[PDB]
C-alpha cells in the first residue's frame, strides 16, 4: 500500500494580515515599492509559485487549491448562464418555434439610449441575441421549462460554494504532502476510470432515461408543457416502453449479453436527424456508453497498490532503439517532478482537442437545431479555434520554462531530450527550409493569380477553369467516407457527416449540412494552413530548443526564461529569450487562426449555408463565389472583407449597433498596440523625465517614482492589445454579419 493518503493538518493560518501586505510572496517585492516597476512586477510574478518557493510540496499545494479556485469560478459562470436562461430569456418561446425564434438571454437596462440593443429576437421578447448554443444544449438535455433552469442554476451555485470551500480547506486545513501528488499511476487510473469513464456512463444514463424520451416527444411534435416530467420516465417503465419497446425487457439483455435487444435506443444510425438537423441522440447515447466502457477499462492499466498493472517508468525505459540512445529513460522523473513539463503537455493536448472540437461540431452537428442556427455555428467554431491556438502557444511557453528551469543535464544524459538538443540545428534548418518552400508555393500561387488576373491572362491562373491544382487526396478520402455506409462500416445506415458527400439536410428550409466540395481554392487555402502552422511551429520550437544556450549567447539559461536581451553587442541580441519566441509565435498563431476562421466563414456561406427553394435547389448566402474568387488576394479583400463588412458598418441605429461600435473600438485598440510594439523604453523614460520635472515644479511629484514599462512589459502590452484588437475586430465582424444574414 505505497499509494496512501498523507496530509499536513492546519498548515497555513487563515489570516487577513498578508492581504494587507501586497507583495508578501516574494523577497524582492515584500520590501515595498520605490519605483512604479514594483507595481507591475507584483502582478507579473504572482502565480509563478516555483519562483517564490523552493519546495515542490508548497508549490503543489498552491496549485491544487488554485485549481479549486478556478473550478469555483467556472461553476459560478455556468450557474449564471443557467440563471440568465431561466430569468432573462426567451427559452420557453424558443422551444415551441426553434426555427423562428432567435435565442436571447441578455437584456440591457435603459440608460443612455442603450436599450436599442434590446432587439426583437422573437417570441414576444426583446434582448441581446446570444450565440453560445446554450438553448440547444438545454433542449438536448431535455429541460423544457424555466423552473428546471432555476434548479440547474442552484446546483451550479452549490458546486461553486463547495469548490471554493475545498480550495480553502485543502490549503489551510488539510494540505496533502508531496508524495500524495506524486502518484501518477493512481491519478491516471482515477481520471480515466472515475472522471472520464463514470462521467460518460452517468451522462449516457441521463441521455437514455431523460434526453431520449423527452426529445422523442419533442420531435414528434408534442408541446413542451404537454410532456411528462423526467422522473415519470424513470418510474413508469410502461410509458418508457411505449416510446422504446426494448425497455419492456429491462436489464436482463444487458447482463445476459443479449445486447441486440437494445437497438431501439442504442443505434448506429449516422447522419443527421431530419427533423432537428442534429445527431441522432440514440447514437450519442450509444457513443457515450461505449466511450464509458473503454475509459473504465483503460483506467485499470497502471499499477497502484496490488501487483497487477503497469509501471509507467518501466514502459518508458523499455522503449529504446538504435537511433535514440537510452530512449525514454528519465522522462518519468521529469513528468513527476516538474509541473511546467506537465503543463506544456496538457496545454498542447487541450488546445489540439479544442481545434478538433471546432471541426467536428460544425461537421456533425450534435445538438438539435444548432446546425441551422448559423450565428451559433460560426461563434462556437471561431471560439474553439481561438481557445485551441492560445493553449498550443502556452504549451510551448511552458516547455521553455521547463527547459530553462527544471531541466538538469545530469539526469538527462543521452536520452531523447539530450539528443534533440544535440541536433537542434538540423531540426531548425530543415523546418526553416520547409517554411520557405511552403510560403513560396502557397502564397506565391495567390500572387501569381493576382498578377495574371490583373494582366488580363485568366488562362494562366491556378484555378478550376485554368491550370488546376486539384485536391485529389482529399477528394478521394471524401469518396471513401461516402462509400463507407454498408461497405466498410456495414451496420451504419448513413455517413458520419454529409460534409463528405450525400444528401442535403434542410431544417426549416435552411441547410443543416450538405457536401463541402473541394477545388483549386481549397487546395490553395489548405496549403496556406500548412504554411502558417509550420511557421508557428518553427518559432515556438526554436524558442524551446535554444532556450538554454545558442551560438549567439552561450549561457542563456543564467539569464532566465524571460529576459529582454543581452546587450547591443554581438551585433544585437534583442528578443533572444524563450519568452520572446512565445511572444513572436502568438503573432503567427493569430495569423494562422485568422485565416482558418476566414476560410470557414467564407466557404460555409458560399457553398454550404443558405435556403432550400422548391425543386431542391439551394441558394447560398454569398452565392458560390468562393470557387472563383478565393484564388486571388483581391478576391479575399473584395468579395470577403469588403462585401461582408457591410453589416457591421451599416449597423448604427439597430440592435447590432453594439457590434458596429466594437468593430471600431477594436480597430482602435489594435492600432494603439503598435505604439507599444514599434517603440522603445528609452524614449518613454526620457519623456517621463520632463513630465516629472513639471510635477517637481508644482511640488506634486509622487514618491513611487514613475518609470517607463520594462522592455518585456512593453512587448507584453503590445501583444495583448494587438490580439485584443484583431480578435475583437473579427468578433464584431463575424457576429453582425452572420446575425443579419444567417
Amino acid at each position: 500500500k505505497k499509494v496512501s493518503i498523507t496530509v499536513d493538518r492546519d498548515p497555513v493560518a487563515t489570516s487577513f494580515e498578508k492581504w494587507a501586505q501586497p507583495g508578501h510572496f516574494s523577497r524582492t517585492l515584500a520590501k515595498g515599492p520605490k519605483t512604479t516597476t514594483w507595481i507591475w512586477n507584483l502582478h507579473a510574478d504572482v502565480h509563478d509559485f516555483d519562483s517564490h518557493t523552493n519546495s515542490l510540496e508548497d508549490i503543489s499545494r498552491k496549485i491544487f487549491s488554485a485549481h479549486f479556485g478556478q473550478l469555483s469560478i467556472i461553476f459560478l459562470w455556468l450557474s449564471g448562464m443557467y440563471f440568465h436562461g431561466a430569468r432573462f430569456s426567451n427559452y420557453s418561446a424558443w422551444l415551441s418555434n426553434p426555427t423562428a425564434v432567435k435565442p436571447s438571454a441578455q437584456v440591457v437596462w435603459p440608460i443612455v439610449g442603450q436599450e436599442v440593443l434590446n432587439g426583437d429576437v422573437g417570441g414576444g421578447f426583446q434582448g441581446v441575441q446570444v450565440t453560445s448554443g446554450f438553448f440547444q444544449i438545454w433542449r438536448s438535455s431535455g429541460i423544457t421549462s424555466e423552473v428546471e433552469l432555476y434548479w440547474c442554476a442552484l446546483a451550479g451555485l452549490i458546486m461553486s460554494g463547495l469548490m471554493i470551500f475545498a480550495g480553502w480547506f485543502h490549503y489551510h486545513k488539510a494540505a496533502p504532502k508531496l508524495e500524495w501528488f506524486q502518484n501518477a499511476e493512481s491519478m491516471l487510473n482515477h481520471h480515466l476510470s472515475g472522471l472520464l469513464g463514470l462521467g460518460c456512463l452517468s451522462w449516457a444514463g441521463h441521455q437514455i432515461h431523460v434526453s431520449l424520451p423527452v426529445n422523442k416527444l419533442l420531435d414528434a411534435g408534442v408541446a413542451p408543457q404537454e410532456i411528462p416530467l423526467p422522473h415519470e420516465f424513470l418510474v413508469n417503465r410502461d410509458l418508457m416502453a411505449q416510446l422504446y419497446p426494448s425497455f419492456s425487457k429491462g436489464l436482463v439483455p444487458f447482463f445476459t449479453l443479449n445486447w441486440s435487444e437494445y437497438s431501439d435506443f442504442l443505434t448506429f444510425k449516422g447522419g443527421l436527424n431530419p427533423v432537428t438537423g442534429g445527431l441522432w441522440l440514440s447514437d450519442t447515447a450509444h457513443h457515450h456508453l461505449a466511450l464509458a466502457v473503454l475509459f473504465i477499462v483503460a483506467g485499470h492499466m497502471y499499477r497502484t497498490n496490488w501487483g497487477i498493472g503497469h509501471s509507467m517508468k518501466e514502459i518508458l525505459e523499455a522503449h529504446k532503439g538504435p537511433f535514440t540512445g537510452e530512449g525514454h529513460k528519465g522522462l518519468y522523473e521529469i513528468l513527476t517532478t516538474s509541473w511546467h513539463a506537465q503543463l506544456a503537455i496538457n496545454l498542447a493536448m487541450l488546445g489540439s482537442v479544442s481545434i478538433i472540437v471546432a471541426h467536428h461540431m460544425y461537421a456533425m452537428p450534435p445538438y438539435p437545431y444548432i446546425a441551422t442556427d448559423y450565428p451559433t455555428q460560426l461563434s462556437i467554431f471561431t471560439h474553439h479555434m481561438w481557445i485551441g491556438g492560445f493553449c498550443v502557444c502556452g504549451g510551448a511557453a511552458h516547455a521553455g520554462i521547463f527547459m530553462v528551469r527544471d531541466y538538469n543535464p545530469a539526469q538527462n544524459y543521452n536520452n531523447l531530450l539530450d539528443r534533440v538538443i544535440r541536433h537542434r540545428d538540423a531540426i531548425i534548418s530543415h523546418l526553416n527550409w520547409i517554411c520557405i518552400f511552403l510560403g513560396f508555393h502557397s502564397f506565391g500561387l495567390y500572387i501569381h493569380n493576382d498578377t495574371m488576373r490583373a494582366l488580363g491572362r485568366t488562362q494562366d491562373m491556378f484555378s478550376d477553369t485554368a491550370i488546376q491544382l486539384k485536391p485529389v487526396f482529399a477528394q478521394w478520402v471524401q469518396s471513401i467516407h461516402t462509400l463507407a455506409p454498408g461497405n466498410t462500416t456495414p451496420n451504419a445506415l448513413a455517413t458520419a457527416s454529409y460534409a463528405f458527400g450525400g444528401d442535403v439536410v434542410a431544417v426549416g428550409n435552411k441547410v443543416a449540412m450538405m457536401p463541402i466540395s473541394l477545388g483549386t481554392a481549397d487546395f490553395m487555402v489548405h496549403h496556406i494552413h500548412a504554411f502558417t502552422i509550420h511557421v508557428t511551429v518553427l518559432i515556438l520550437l526554436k524558442g524551446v530548443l535554444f532556450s538554454r544556450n545558442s551560438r549567439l549567447i552561450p549561457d542563456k539559461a543564467n539569464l532566465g526564461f524571460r529576459f529582454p536581451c543581452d546587450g547591443p553587442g554581438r551585433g544585437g541580441t534583442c528578443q533572444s529569450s524563450a519568452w520572446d519566441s512565445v511572444f513572436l509565435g502568438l503573432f503567427w498563431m493569430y495569423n494562422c487562426i485568422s485565416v482558418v476562421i476566414f476560410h470557414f466563414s467564407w466557404k460555409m456561406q458560399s457553398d454550404v449555408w443558405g435556403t432550400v427553394q422548391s425543386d431542391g435547389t439551394v441558394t447560398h448566402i454569398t452565392g458560390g463565389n468562393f470557387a472563383q474568387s478565393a484564388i486571388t488576394i483581391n478576391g479575399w479583400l473584395r468579395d470577403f472583407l469588403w462585401a461582408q463588412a457591410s453589416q457591421v458598418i451599416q449597423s448604427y441605429g439597430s440592435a447590432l449597433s453594439a457590434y458596429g461600435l466594437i468593430f471600431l473600438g477594436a480597430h482602435f485598440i489594435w492600432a494603439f498596440s503598435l505604439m507599444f510594439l514599434f517603440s522603445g523604453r528609452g524614449y518613454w523614460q526620457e519623456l517621463i523625465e520632463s513630465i516629472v520635472w513639471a510635477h517637481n515644479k508644482l511640488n506634486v511629484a509622487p514618491a513611487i517614482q514613475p518609470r517607463a514599462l520594462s522592455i518585456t512589459q512593453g512587448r507584453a502590452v503590445g501583444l495583448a492589445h494587438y490580439l485584443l484588437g484583431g480578435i475583437g475586430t473579427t468578433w464584431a465582424f463575424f457576429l453582425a454579419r452572420i446575425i443579419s444574414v444567417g
Binding site: 534583442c574 514599434f678 522603445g680 524614449y683 523614460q685 526620457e686 522592455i711
Partner: protein, 74 residues
C-alpha cells in the same frame, strides 16, 4: 466636421512636434544618458542596464516622428 478635423490636425502637428523637439533637445544628453553626445546621432541603445534604453538616440526620435508625420498627412 471641419472643426473636428482641424482639432485632429492640431493634435497631430503638436505631437509630431513633441517627438521631434524632444529628440533635438535631448540629443546631447538626458538623465538616462547624460553623455549621449559621445555616442553620436544614430546608435542602437545603451544596453539593458538602468532599466533598458531602446530607442534612446535622437535618430530614434526621427524614427518615431516619421509615423506621426505619416498619420498627420493621412
Amino acid at each position: 466636421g471641419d472643426f473636428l478635423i482641424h482639432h485632429a490636425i492640431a493634435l497631430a502637428l503638436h505631437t509630431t512636434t513633441l517627438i521631434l523637439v524632444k529628440g533635438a533637445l535631448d540629443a546631447r544628453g538626458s538623465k538616462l544618458m547624460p553623455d549621449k553626445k559621445d555616442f553620436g546621432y544614430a546608435f542602437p541603445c545603451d544596453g539593458p542596464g538602468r532599466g533598458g534604453t531602446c530607442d534612446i538616440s535622437a535618430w530614434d526620435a526621427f524614427y518615431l516622428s516619421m509615423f506621426w508625420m505619416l498619420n498627420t498627412i493621412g
